[PDB]
Amino acid sequence: LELNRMRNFDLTAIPCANHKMHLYLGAAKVEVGTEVTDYRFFVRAIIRHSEASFEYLQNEGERL
């Protein structure tokens, strides 16, 4: 999870069911001079649930 690509952001890990999916709320990490400007809801998953895979991936995706 290339999570260093948002180090200039502030994300807090909340433990969660469907434990694959970790969703973080992001505040733009800024310097002491300034206060965060971006406020994005992030949902960050991992996907490994065992052509079928692709359809499975899609369908499972809506459910998820």
Partner: protein, 131 residues
Amino acid sequence: LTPTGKAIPIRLFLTNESGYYLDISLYKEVTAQIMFQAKQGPLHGMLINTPYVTKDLLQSKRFQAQSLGTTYIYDIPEMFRQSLIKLWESMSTQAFLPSPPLPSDMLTYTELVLDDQGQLVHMNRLPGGNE
């Protein structure tokens, strides 16, 4: 793929704004720091650990524009659309016109940029990109 035995990774990044327009940025992971390679794609080639743009760039320029009593350039395409959608309805009063399109379908843009020789190049990129 099915015979090949050549597993590729494809860091695909999906792009959707207001409207149901879904722009798919599909690349391939190509070598030494991996490189998004498919068209021309919004931020076609970049390395993969490209830290994420912070919005306040866009915000910063719009404030300057309102302060001169005008509209920020990369907000113009939707301003074209809002005026254009509003126009399609009002003109139906005046004339029989075809049915208006959906807000996603009213307008599409591609950035035009000069190469070294002052020649045009088509680029489908994210707002905020002027150099």
